[PDB]
Amino acid sequence: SQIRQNYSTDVEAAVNSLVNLYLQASYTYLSLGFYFDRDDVALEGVSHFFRELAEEKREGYERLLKMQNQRGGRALFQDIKKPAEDEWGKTPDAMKAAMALEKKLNQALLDLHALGSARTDPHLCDFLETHFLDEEVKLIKKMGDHLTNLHRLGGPEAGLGEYLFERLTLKHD
Amino acid sequence: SQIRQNYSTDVEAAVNSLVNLYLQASYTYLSLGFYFDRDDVALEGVSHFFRELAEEKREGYERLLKMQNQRGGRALFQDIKKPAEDEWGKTPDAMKAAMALEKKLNQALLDLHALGSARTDPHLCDFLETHFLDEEVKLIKKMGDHLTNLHRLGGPEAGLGEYLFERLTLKHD
Amino acid sequence: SQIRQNYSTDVEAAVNSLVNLYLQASYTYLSLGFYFDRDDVALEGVSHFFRELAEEKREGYERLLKMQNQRGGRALFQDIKKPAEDEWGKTPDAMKAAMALEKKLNQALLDLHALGSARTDPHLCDFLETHFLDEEVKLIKKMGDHLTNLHRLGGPEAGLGEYLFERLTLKHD
Amino acid sequence: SQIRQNYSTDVEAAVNSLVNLYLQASYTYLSLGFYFDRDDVALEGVSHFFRELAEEKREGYERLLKMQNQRGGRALFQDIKKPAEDEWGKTPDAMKAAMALEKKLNQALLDLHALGSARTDPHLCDFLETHFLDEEVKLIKKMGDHLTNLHRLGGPEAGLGEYLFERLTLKHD
Amino acid sequence: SQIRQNYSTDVEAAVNSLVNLYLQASYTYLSLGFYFDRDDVALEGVSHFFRELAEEKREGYERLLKMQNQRGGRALFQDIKKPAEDEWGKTPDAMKAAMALEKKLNQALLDLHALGSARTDPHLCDFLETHFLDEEVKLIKKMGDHLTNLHRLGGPEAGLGEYLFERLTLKHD
Ligand SMILES: [O-][O-]
Ligand SMILES: [O-][O-]
Ligand SMILES: [O-][O-]
Ligand SMILES: [O-][O-]
Ligand SMILES: [O-][O-]
Ligand SMILES: [O-][O-]
Ligand SMILES: [O-][O-]
Ligand SMILES: [O-][O-]
Ligand SMILES: [O-][O-]
Ligand SMILES: [O-][O-]
Ligand SMILES: [O-][O-]
Ligand SMILES: [O-][O-]
Ligand SMILES: [O-][O-]
Ligand SMILES: [O-][O-]
Ligand SMILES: [O-][O-]
Ligand SMILES: [Fe+3]
Ligand SMILES: [Fe+3]
Ligand SMILES: [Fe+3]
Ligand SMILES: [Fe+3]
Ligand SMILES: [Fe+3]
Ligand SMILES: [Fe+3]
Ligand SMILES: [Fe+3]
Ligand SMILES: [Fe+3]
Ligand SMILES: [Fe+3]
Ligand SMILES: [Fe+3]
Ligand SMILES: [Fe+3]
Ligand SMILES: [Fe+3]
Ligand SMILES: [Fe+3]
Ligand SMILES: [Fe+3]
Ligand SMILES: [Fe+3]
Ligand SMILES: [Fe+3]
Ligand SMILES: [Fe+3]
Ligand SMILES: [Fe+3]
Ligand SMILES: [Fe+3]
Ligand SMILES: [Fe+3]
């Protein structure tokens, strides 16, 4: 590139990798979102919560692609693997899957930041600090809170608690 | 003081004492407030309720300090003792601690009013009547009401009741 | 914590420590603020300046506590030591104490950032960069400016200069 | 009186006495106010400050007279003694006279409250608490502050300090 | 130039020269402006006054360059010499340097006008009359006024006068 300056080929490759991980995360949330809209699951606030995450992950990979072009790297795309489950169980099972996905993304971001640090790329380090690291921390905190309220609502009266959590914590209608 | 008139040195000292008690109460509510924001407690309306009390106790000690200066006494500060617990249990345990704290503050206010009465200081007596005694009575009544609704929600289905009380009585989002 | 990821127990402890330092700084500014409101000191712009700093330090420790909870650490509180003086002298003595306090806080922030760097915690490093380091630098610059104008106003005509500085530099009525 | 209930003849008399003291205080502030408007004194902010006090003392005696009629006592007026000085010196001499006057009024209010207490007249006690005691405390605190700023401005450069205090503390034009 | 008409090569060269003098004057005011913002000088109204002059000199050289192009001359730039001092002393020393700089610019403008007159270039003569000569006269008059008020404020109480002049004559906050 006539513009490329201080941008390691290893960072360029790891940015492409992280774009595939966001594409795959977005597709997982797509599937979670539709699953909760099934007539035999029918938790619209849960569905909305995951659809909005599919959108947020989408903005993540678009931001990464834009930055790849601003630095003079070249986007390379790979096949996007289907989500790990076809059916996602009850609200607490889905939320625990989402939390494990966000931990995996957060560790990928932290590995990419360590890589950019090792290549002394402060533009890369600040881009991740600014647009990604704090957003992940807030989201994981929010999922932890939701798992804790789902657990206080669980036990023998679990169907009732699931109905209440969807109605009084999550956003709907 | 060139301004000091009818202001006993014993009232001045007891005002300093009561400022330390408010500082300590404010710090207790700080700790309650953050405890309820932990990802493994996650009751935002409970957290909000205690954070607002930390603020209200803050206004109490600032009002006492301003009055100390208006009467020509001298503020003297002491170390502020840490709150009595590091972890505050469930909503009803926290609310019972808060109620015991407000009883202790209310008795301190009532002892300071008896002292000002014994020193025939009607400015002091009216300052406490106006800014403190009725606010404590209202708050204790409100905590009594909350304890009564927590008790009707307790028993075997306690986690559910705690989730409902936070959602439908306390203020959040 | 079900949410804790890449958050060292040493950072968690040093965040608790820094919260105690902010609590103590806030309490120092409380005392400075009331001291300047005494009828025999009576510099309302000086009092306002320190009261606003008590508030700003308050926002600092609340921000640190919120971040401790977002990362999945646990707030632990200790006794808050009383301020180092009961009487704070004239404006330039108070401002030199405030400056020494802000230097000590700034060095604590810089030590916590070096610690987070040594534990490769970029969320921590960016949190301090964003919310604390530049605010301290600006405040210390402002205190340096105030000390320089107090010094040009000092000497034999010191009472006059102190009255003018409070009236024409500091905010009041 | 067909309306008089629980209103001691000694309180009625002491209310008449206190009305004469307010009339005399108002007349002292009248004289202070015009003195500072003399072409050879010419401190308009000082003049304004005392004229406003003449008005405030006026509202005091009118409030006392209205209350005398509400309780069914009978206003009795006596000759109003002229102010203690024809010329009031410099700002700090005038402010020290005003402060001594407000101390004397404050002690009269405190003696009337002790009297109403000894006659178990809680309407009287609350009337003084509500309309007089806190207003006196605030005013004396304000005069103490002004005396302290006048003192920091005094010494060999006293004419200059007096000009600055009038311009930058007191209200004018 | 296909447009050049009645534009002497000596005027073109002297316009390039005068552009270098304005660049150098602008850079002097830059340095004055930052010097007065140092924590150990701290006179914000003085700093503002010189920063605005850096801007005004900037508009001067841009106006000269635009006019050079309108007449069909060719801008030629030379190295811009650093300002004559690294530290500018107190307000009156800085203002006397600024005044000497404006005298030198004013004499350069007057020499360029005499040159354009000798080449019978009335477009040049009117351009300088309209955009430069009266602006210099007003500015020098204003600097003379400031030097006179600084001198009435000088002597043994010089630090005080400097603080007052910055606060009550110059623009700040
Ligand atoms: O949600 O945009
Ligand atoms: O839209 O973020
Ligand atoms: O939604 O950002
Ligand atoms: O709540 O103010
Ligand atoms: O704010 O009370
Ligand atoms: O909130 O008062
Ligand atoms: O100051 O908020
Ligand atoms: O409020 O910062
Ligand atoms: O005040 O931020
Ligand atoms: O002043 O009414
Ligand atoms: O009018 O008080
Ligand atoms: O003026 O009340
Ligand atoms: O100043 O434009
Ligand atoms: O802008 O002149
Ligand atoms: O500023 O022209
Ligand atoms: Fe959306
Ligand atoms: Fe969104
Ligand atoms: Fe978004
Ligand atoms: Fe969006
Ligand atoms: Fe609030
Ligand atoms: Fe409040
Ligand atoms: Fe309040
Ligand atoms: Fe409030
Ligand atoms: Fe504020
Ligand atoms: Fe603030
Ligand atoms: Fe703030
Ligand atoms: Fe604020
Ligand atoms: Fe009036
Ligand atoms: Fe009035
Ligand atoms: Fe009034
Ligand atoms: Fe009035
Ligand atoms: Fe400008
Ligand atoms: Fe300009
Ligand atoms: Fe301009
Ligand atoms: Fe301009």
JSON list of C-alpha atoms in Angstrom, two decimals, chain C:
[
{"chain": "C", "resi": 1, "resn": "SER", "atom": "CA", "xyz": [-16.76, -14.21, 39.46]},
{"chain": "C", "resi": 2, "resn": "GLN", "atom": "CA", "xyz": [-18.59, -15.66, 36.54]},
{"chain": "C", "resi": 3, "resn": "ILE", "atom": "CA", "xyz": [-17.54, -12.42, 34.70]},
{"chain": "C", "resi": 4, "resn": "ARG", "atom": "CA", "xyz": [-13.93, -11.89, 35.81]},
{"chain": "C", "resi": 5, "resn": "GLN", "atom": "CA", "xyz": [-11.50, -12.10, 32.88]},
{"chain": "C", "resi": 6, "resn": "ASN", "atom": "CA", "xyz": [-7.88, -10.78, 32.75]},
{"chain": "C", "resi": 7, "resn": "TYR", "atom": "CA", "xyz": [-8.33, -8.93, 36.10]},
{"chain": "C", "resi": 8, "resn": "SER", "atom": "CA", "xyz": [-5.37, -9.55, 38.48]},
{"chain": "C", "resi": 9, "resn": "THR", "atom": "CA", "xyz": [-6.03, -9.94, 42.21]},
{"chain": "C", "resi": 10, "resn": "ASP", "atom": "CA", "xyz": [-3.19, -7.42, 42.69]},
{"chain": "C", "resi": 11, "resn": "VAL", "atom": "CA", "xyz": [-5.04, -4.83, 40.53]},
{"chain": "C", "resi": 12, "resn": "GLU", "atom": "CA", "xyz": [-8.27, -5.53, 42.45]},
{"chain": "C", "resi": 13, "resn": "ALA", "atom": "CA", "xyz": [-6.44, -4.87, 45.73]},
{"chain": "C", "resi": 14, "resn": "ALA", "atom": "CA", "xyz": [-4.67, -1.78, 44.43]},
{"chain": "C", "resi": 15, "resn": "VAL", "atom": "CA", "xyz": [-8.12, -0.41, 43.15]},
{"chain": "C", "resi": 16, "resn": "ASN", "atom": "CA", "xyz": [-9.46, -0.88, 46.74]},
{"chain": "C", "resi": 17, "resn": "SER", "atom": "CA", "xyz": [-6.42, 0.96, 48.04]},
{"chain": "C", "resi": 18, "resn": "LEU", "atom": "CA", "xyz": [-6.84, 3.80, 45.57]},
{"chain": "C", "resi": 19, "resn": "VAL", "atom": "CA", "xyz": [-10.60, 4.05, 46.56]},
{"chain": "C", "resi": 20, "resn": "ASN", "atom": "CA", "xyz": [-9.48, 4.61, 50.20]},
{"chain": "C", "resi": 21, "resn": "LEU", "atom": "CA", "xyz": [-7.00, 7.32, 49.01]},
{"chain": "C", "resi": 22, "resn": "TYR", "atom": "CA", "xyz": [-9.82, 9.10, 47.06]},
{"chain": "C", "resi": 23, "resn": "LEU", "atom": "CA", "xyz": [-12.18, 8.81, 50.14]},
{"chain": "C", "resi": 24, "resn": "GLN", "atom": "CA", "xyz": [-9.43, 10.38, 52.25]},
{"chain": "C", "resi": 25, "resn": "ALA", "atom": "CA", "xyz": [-8.76, 13.11, 49.62]},
{"chain": "C", "resi": 26, "resn": "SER", "atom": "CA", "xyz": [-12.49, 13.91, 49.36]},
{"chain": "C", "resi": 27, "resn": "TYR", "atom": "CA", "xyz": [-12.58, 14.19, 53.21]},
{"chain": "C", "resi": 28, "resn": "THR", "atom": "CA", "xyz": [-9.53, 16.54, 53.16]},
{"chain": "C", "resi": 29, "resn": "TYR", "atom": "CA", "xyz": [-11.35, 18.83, 50.71]},
{"chain": "C", "resi": 30, "resn": "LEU", "atom": "CA", "xyz": [-14.47, 18.71, 52.87]},
{"chain": "C", "resi": 31, "resn": "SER", "atom": "CA", "xyz": [-12.45, 20.00, 55.76]},
{"chain": "C", "resi": 32, "resn": "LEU", "atom": "CA", "xyz": [-10.69, 22.65, 53.61]},
{"chain": "C", "resi": 33, "resn": "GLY", "atom": "CA", "xyz": [-14.09, 23.76, 52.30]},
{"chain": "C", "resi": 34, "resn": "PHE", "atom": "CA", "xyz": [-15.63, 24.31, 55.74]},
{"chain": "C", "resi": 35, "resn": "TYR", "atom": "CA", "xyz": [-12.53, 25.87, 57.13]},
{"chain": "C", "resi": 36, "resn": "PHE", "atom": "CA", "xyz": [-12.73, 28.71, 54.50]},
{"chain": "C", "resi": 37, "resn": "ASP", "atom": "CA", "xyz": [-16.45, 29.26, 55.39]},
{"chain": "C", "resi": 38, "resn": "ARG", "atom": "CA", "xyz": [-15.50, 30.01, 59.14]},
{"chain": "C", "resi": 39, "resn": "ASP", "atom": "CA", "xyz": [-16.56, 33.56, 60.13]},
{"chain": "C", "resi": 40, "resn": "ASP", "atom": "CA", "xyz": [-12.93, 34.30, 61.00]},
{"chain": "C", "resi": 41, "resn": "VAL", "atom": "CA", "xyz": [-11.56, 33.07, 57.63]},
{"chain": "C", "resi": 42, "resn": "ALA", "atom": "CA", "xyz": [-14.49, 34.08, 55.38]},
{"chain": "C", "resi": 43, "resn": "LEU", "atom": "CA", "xyz": [-13.21, 33.51, 51.79]},
{"chain": "C", "resi": 44, "resn": "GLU", "atom": "CA", "xyz": [-16.21, 32.17, 50.04]},
{"chain": "C", "resi": 45, "resn": "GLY", "atom": "CA", "xyz": [-14.56, 31.68, 46.57]},
{"chain": "C", "resi": 46, "resn": "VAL", "atom": "CA", "xyz": [-11.77, 29.58, 48.35]},
{"chain": "C", "resi": 47, "resn": "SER", "atom": "CA", "xyz": [-14.40, 27.56, 50.17]},
{"chain": "C", "resi": 48, "resn": "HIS", "atom": "CA", "xyz": [-16.32, 26.94, 46.92]},
{"chain": "C", "resi": 49, "resn": "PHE", "atom": "CA", "xyz": [-13.09, 25.86, 45.14]},
{"chain": "C", "resi": 50, "resn": "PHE", "atom": "CA", "xyz": [-12.38, 23.17, 47.78]},
{"chain": "C", "resi": 51, "resn": "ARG", "atom": "CA", "xyz": [-16.02, 22.03, 48.11]},
{"chain": "C", "resi": 52, "resn": "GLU", "atom": "CA", "xyz": [-16.10, 21.41, 44.36]},
{"chain": "C", "resi": 53, "resn": "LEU", "atom": "CA", "xyz": [-12.84, 19.36, 44.71]},
{"chain": "C", "resi": 54, "resn": "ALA", "atom": "CA", "xyz": [-14.47, 17.23, 47.46]},
{"chain": "C", "resi": 55, "resn": "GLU", "atom": "CA", "xyz": [-17.21, 16.49, 44.93]},
{"chain": "C", "resi": 56, "resn": "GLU", "atom": "CA", "xyz": [-14.82, 15.73, 42.14]},
{"chain": "C", "resi": 57, "resn": "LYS", "atom": "CA", "xyz": [-12.85, 13.23, 44.33]},
{"chain": "C", "resi": 58, "resn": "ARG", "atom": "CA", "xyz": [-16.18, 11.66, 45.24]},
{"chain": "C", "resi": 59, "resn": "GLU", "atom": "CA", "xyz": [-16.93, 11.05, 41.57]},
{"chain": "C", "resi": 60, "resn": "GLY", "atom": "CA", "xyz": [-13.42, 9.54, 41.30]},
{"chain": "C", "resi": 61, "resn": "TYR", "atom": "CA", "xyz": [-13.99, 6.88, 43.96]},
{"chain": "C", "resi": 62, "resn": "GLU", "atom": "CA", "xyz": [-17.49, 6.11, 42.66]},
{"chain": "C", "resi": 63, "resn": "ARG", "atom": "CA", "xyz": [-16.07, 5.59, 39.19]},
{"chain": "C", "resi": 64, "resn": "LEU", "atom": "CA", "xyz": [-13.39, 3.27, 40.64]},
{"chain": "C", "resi": 65, "resn": "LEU", "atom": "CA", "xyz": [-16.02, 1.28, 42.58]},
{"chain": "C", "resi": 66, "resn": "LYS", "atom": "CA", "xyz": [-18.26, 0.96, 39.51]},
{"chain": "C", "resi": 67, "resn": "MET", "atom": "CA", "xyz": [-15.27, -0.28, 37.47]},
{"chain": "C", "resi": 68, "resn": "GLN", "atom": "CA", "xyz": [-14.32, -2.75, 40.27]},
{"chain": "C", "resi": 69, "resn": "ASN", "atom": "CA", "xyz": [-17.83, -4.26, 39.94]},
{"chain": "C", "resi": 70, "resn": "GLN", "atom": "CA", "xyz": [-17.74, -4.23, 36.10]},
{"chain": "C", "resi": 71, "resn": "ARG", "atom": "CA", "xyz": [-14.51, -6.30, 36.17]},
{"chain": "C", "resi": 72, "resn": "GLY", "atom": "CA", "xyz": [-15.85, -8.67, 38.78]},
{"chain": "C", "resi": 73, "resn": "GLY", "atom": "CA", "xyz": [-13.59, -7.53, 41.70]},
{"chain": "C", "resi": 74, "resn": "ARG", "atom": "CA", "xyz": [-14.95, -7.00, 45.16]},
{"chain": "C", "resi": 75, "resn": "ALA", "atom": "CA", "xyz": [-15.00, -3.61, 46.89]},
{"chain": "C", "resi": 76, "resn": "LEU", "atom": "CA", "xyz": [-13.43, -3.81, 50.42]},
{"chain": "C", "resi": 77, "resn": "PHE", "atom": "CA", "xyz": [-13.51, -0.67, 52.52]},
{"chain": "C", "resi": 78, "resn": "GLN", "atom": "CA", "xyz": [-11.11, 0.39, 55.36]},
{"chain": "C", "resi": 79, "resn": "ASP", "atom": "CA", "xyz": [-11.29, 3.20, 57.93]},
{"chain": "C", "resi": 80, "resn": "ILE", "atom": "CA", "xyz": [-10.90, 6.64, 56.34]},
{"chain": "C", "resi": 81, "resn": "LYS", "atom": "CA", "xyz": [-8.12, 8.61, 58.10]},
{"chain": "C", "resi": 82, "resn": "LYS", "atom": "CA", "xyz": [-9.00, 12.15, 59.16]},
{"chain": "C", "resi": 83, "resn": "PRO", "atom": "CA", "xyz": [-7.41, 15.06, 57.31]},
{"chain": "C", "resi": 84, "resn": "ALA", "atom": "CA", "xyz": [-3.80, 15.99, 58.24]},
{"chain": "C", "resi": 85, "resn": "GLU", "atom": "CA", "xyz": [-4.71, 19.46, 59.72]},
{"chain": "C", "resi": 86, "resn": "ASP", "atom": "CA", "xyz": [-7.60, 20.89, 61.74]},
{"chain": "C", "resi": 87, "resn": "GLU", "atom": "CA", "xyz": [-6.83, 24.48, 60.53]},
{"chain": "C", "resi": 88, "resn": "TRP", "atom": "CA", "xyz": [-5.43, 25.22, 57.13]},
{"chain": "C", "resi": 89, "resn": "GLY", "atom": "CA", "xyz": [-3.70, 28.64, 57.45]},
{"chain": "C", "resi": 90, "resn": "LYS", "atom": "CA", "xyz": [-4.09, 31.19, 54.65]},
{"chain": "C", "resi": 91, "resn": "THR", "atom": "CA", "xyz": [-5.07, 30.63, 50.99]},
{"chain": "C", "resi": 92, "resn": "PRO", "atom": "CA", "xyz": [-1.50, 29.90, 49.80]},
{"chain": "C", "resi": 93, "resn": "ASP", "atom": "CA", "xyz": [-0.90, 27.32, 52.65]},
{"chain": "C", "resi": 94, "resn": "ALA", "atom": "CA", "xyz": [-4.18, 25.56, 51.77]},
{"chain": "C", "resi": 95, "resn": "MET", "atom": "CA", "xyz": [-3.46, 25.59, 48.03]},
{"chain": "C", "resi": 96, "resn": "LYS", "atom": "CA", "xyz": [0.07, 24.14, 48.67]},
{"chain": "C", "resi": 97, "resn": "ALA", "atom": "CA", "xyz": [-1.52, 21.34, 50.79]},
{"chain": "C", "resi": 98, "resn": "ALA", "atom": "CA", "xyz": [-4.05, 20.67, 47.98]},
{"chain": "C", "resi": 99, "resn": "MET", "atom": "CA", "xyz": [-1.29, 20.56, 45.41]},
{"chain": "C", "resi": 100, "resn": "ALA", "atom": "CA", "xyz": [0.75, 18.04, 47.57]},
{"chain": "C", "resi": 101, "resn": "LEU", "atom": "CA", "xyz": [-2.50, 15.93, 47.88]},
{"chain": "C", "resi": 102, "resn": "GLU", "atom": "CA", "xyz": [-3.08, 15.98, 44.09]},
{"chain": "C", "resi": 103, "resn": "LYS", "atom": "CA", "xyz": [0.62, 14.99, 43.46]},
{"chain": "C", "resi": 104, "resn": "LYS", "atom": "CA", "xyz": [0.14, 12.02, 45.80]},
{"chain": "C", "resi": 105, "resn": "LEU", "atom": "CA", "xyz": [-3.06, 11.00, 44.04]},
{"chain": "C", "resi": 106, "resn": "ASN", "atom": "CA", "xyz": [-1.45, 11.46, 40.60]},
{"chain": "C", "resi": 107, "resn": "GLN", "atom": "CA", "xyz": [1.51, 9.21, 41.68]},
{"chain": "C", "resi": 108, "resn": "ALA", "atom": "CA", "xyz": [-0.98, 6.57, 42.93]},
{"chain": "C", "resi": 109, "resn": "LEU", "atom": "CA", "xyz": [-2.77, 6.66, 39.58]},
{"chain": "C", "resi": 110, "resn": "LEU", "atom": "CA", "xyz": [0.58, 6.40, 37.72]},
{"chain": "C", "resi": 111, "resn": "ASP", "atom": "CA", "xyz": [1.59, 3.45, 40.02]},
{"chain": "C", "resi": 112, "resn": "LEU", "atom": "CA", "xyz": [-1.73, 1.74, 39.37]},
{"chain": "C", "resi": 113, "resn": "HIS", "atom": "CA", "xyz": [-1.33, 2.25, 35.55]},
{"chain": "C", "resi": 114, "resn": "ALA", "atom": "CA", "xyz": [2.29, 0.70, 35.74]},
{"chain": "C", "resi": 115, "resn": "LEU", "atom": "CA", "xyz": [0.79, -2.22, 37.69]},
{"chain": "C", "resi": 116, "resn": "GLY", "atom": "CA", "xyz": [-1.96, -2.78, 35.11]},
{"chain": "C", "resi": 117, "resn": "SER", "atom": "CA", "xyz": [0.68, -2.53, 32.39]},
{"chain": "C", "resi": 118, "resn": "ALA", "atom": "CA", "xyz": [2.84, -5.16, 34.17]},
{"chain": "C", "resi": 119, "resn": "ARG", "atom": "CA", "xyz": [-0.31, -7.42, 34.38]},
{"chain": "C", "resi": 120, "resn": "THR", "atom": "CA", "xyz": [-1.12, -6.61, 30.67]},
{"chain": "C", "resi": 121, "resn": "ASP", "atom": "CA", "xyz": [-4.64, -5.26, 31.55]},
{"chain": "C", "resi": 122, "resn": "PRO", "atom": "CA", "xyz": [-5.41, -2.81, 28.74]},
{"chain": "C", "resi": 123, "resn": "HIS", "atom": "CA", "xyz": [-9.03, -2.20, 29.94]},
{"chain": "C", "resi": 124, "resn": "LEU", "atom": "CA", "xyz": [-7.53, -0.89, 33.22]},
{"chain": "C", "resi": 125, "resn": "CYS", "atom": "CA", "xyz": [-4.94, 1.19, 31.39]},
{"chain": "C", "resi": 126, "resn": "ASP", "atom": "CA", "xyz": [-7.52, 2.84, 29.18]},
{"chain": "C", "resi": 127, "resn": "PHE", "atom": "CA", "xyz": [-10.00, 3.42, 32.08]},
{"chain": "C", "resi": 128, "resn": "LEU", "atom": "CA", "xyz": [-7.31, 5.43, 33.97]},
{"chain": "C", "resi": 129, "resn": "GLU", "atom": "CA", "xyz": [-6.20, 7.32, 30.77]},
{"chain": "C", "resi": 130, "resn": "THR", "atom": "CA", "xyz": [-9.75, 8.25, 29.97]},
{"chain": "C", "resi": 131, "resn": "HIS", "atom": "CA", "xyz": [-11.16, 9.19, 33.34]},
{"chain": "C", "resi": 132, "resn": "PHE", "atom": "CA", "xyz": [-8.25, 10.15, 35.58]},
{"chain": "C", "resi": 133, "resn": "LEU", "atom": "CA", "xyz": [-4.82, 10.96, 34.17]},
{"chain": "C", "resi": 134, "resn": "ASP", "atom": "CA", "xyz": [-5.74, 14.01, 32.12]},
{"chain": "C", "resi": 135, "resn": "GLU", "atom": "CA", "xyz": [-8.09, 15.36, 34.80]},
{"chain": "C", "resi": 136, "resn": "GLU", "atom": "CA", "xyz": [-5.21, 15.26, 37.30]},
{"chain": "C", "resi": 137, "resn": "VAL", "atom": "CA", "xyz": [-2.78, 16.95, 34.96]},
{"chain": "C", "resi": 138, "resn": "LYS", "atom": "CA", "xyz": [-5.31, 19.81, 34.29]},
{"chain": "C", "resi": 139, "resn": "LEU", "atom": "CA", "xyz": [-6.05, 20.25, 37.94]},
{"chain": "C", "resi": 140, "resn": "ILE", "atom": "CA", "xyz": [-2.40, 20.37, 38.96]},
{"chain": "C", "resi": 141, "resn": "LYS", "atom": "CA", "xyz": [-1.71, 22.90, 36.23]},
{"chain": "C", "resi": 142, "resn": "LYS", "atom": "CA", "xyz": [-4.60, 25.04, 37.59]},
{"chain": "C", "resi": 143, "resn": "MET", "atom": "CA", "xyz": [-3.25, 24.78, 41.19]},
{"chain": "C", "resi": 144, "resn": "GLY", "atom": "CA", "xyz": [0.25, 25.78, 39.93]},
{"chain": "C", "resi": 145, "resn": "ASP", "atom": "CA", "xyz": [-1.33, 28.80, 38.22]},
{"chain": "C", "resi": 146, "resn": "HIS", "atom": "CA", "xyz": [-3.18, 29.74, 41.42]},
{"chain": "C", "resi": 147, "resn": "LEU", "atom": "CA", "xyz": [0.00, 29.38, 43.51]},
{"chain": "C", "resi": 148, "resn": "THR", "atom": "CA", "xyz": [1.84, 31.65, 41.08]},
{"chain": "C", "resi": 149, "resn": "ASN", "atom": "CA", "xyz": [-0.88, 34.38, 41.32]},
{"chain": "C", "resi": 150, "resn": "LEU", "atom": "CA", "xyz": [-0.96, 34.02, 45.10]},
{"chain": "C", "resi": 151, "resn": "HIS", "atom": "CA", "xyz": [2.79, 34.52, 45.16]},
{"chain": "C", "resi": 152, "resn": "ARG", "atom": "CA", "xyz": [2.65, 37.67, 42.97]},
{"chain": "C", "resi": 153, "resn": "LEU", "atom": "CA", "xyz": [0.00, 38.92, 45.45]},
{"chain": "C", "resi": 154, "resn": "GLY", "atom": "CA", "xyz": [2.03, 37.99, 48.63]},
{"chain": "C", "resi": 155, "resn": "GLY", "atom": "CA", "xyz": [4.60, 39.90, 50.68]},
{"chain": "C", "resi": 156, "resn": "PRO", "atom": "CA", "xyz": [3.85, 42.74, 53.06]},
{"chain": "C", "resi": 157, "resn": "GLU", "atom": "CA", "xyz": [0.44, 43.40, 51.44]},
{"chain": "C", "resi": 158, "resn": "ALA", "atom": "CA", "xyz": [-0.61, 39.71, 51.74]},
{"chain": "C", "resi": 159, "resn": "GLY", "atom": "CA", "xyz": [-4.14, 40.22, 53.34]},
{"chain": "C", "resi": 160, "resn": "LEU", "atom": "CA", "xyz": [-5.10, 42.55, 50.47]},
{"chain": "C", "resi": 161, "resn": "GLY", "atom": "CA", "xyz": [-3.80, 40.12, 47.82]},
{"chain": "C", "resi": 162, "resn": "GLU", "atom": "CA", "xyz": [-5.69, 37.28, 49.40]},
{"chain": "C", "resi": 163, "resn": "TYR", "atom": "CA", "xyz": [-8.91, 39.29, 49.29]},
{"chain": "C", "resi": 164, "resn": "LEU", "atom": "CA", "xyz": [-8.36, 40.21, 45.62]},
{"chain": "C", "resi": 165, "resn": "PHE", "atom": "CA", "xyz": [-7.50, 36.69, 44.48]},
{"chain": "C", "resi": 166, "resn": "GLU", "atom": "CA", "xyz": [-10.65, 35.33, 46.11]},
{"chain": "C", "resi": 167, "resn": "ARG", "atom": "CA", "xyz": [-12.73, 38.07, 44.52]},
{"chain": "C", "resi": 168, "resn": "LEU", "atom": "CA", "xyz": [-11.26, 38.24, 41.01]},
{"chain": "C", "resi": 169, "resn": "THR", "atom": "CA", "xyz": [-9.95, 34.71, 40.28]},
{"chain": "C", "resi": 170, "resn": "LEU", "atom": "CA", "xyz": [-12.11, 32.31, 42.31]},
{"chain": "C", "resi": 171, "resn": "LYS", "atom": "CA", "xyz": [-15.86, 31.74, 41.74]},
{"chain": "C", "resi": 172, "resn": "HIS", "atom": "CA", "xyz": [-18.32, 33.03, 44.34]},
{"chain": "C", "resi": 173, "resn": "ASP", "atom": "CA", "xyz": [-21.80, 34.48, 44.82]}
]
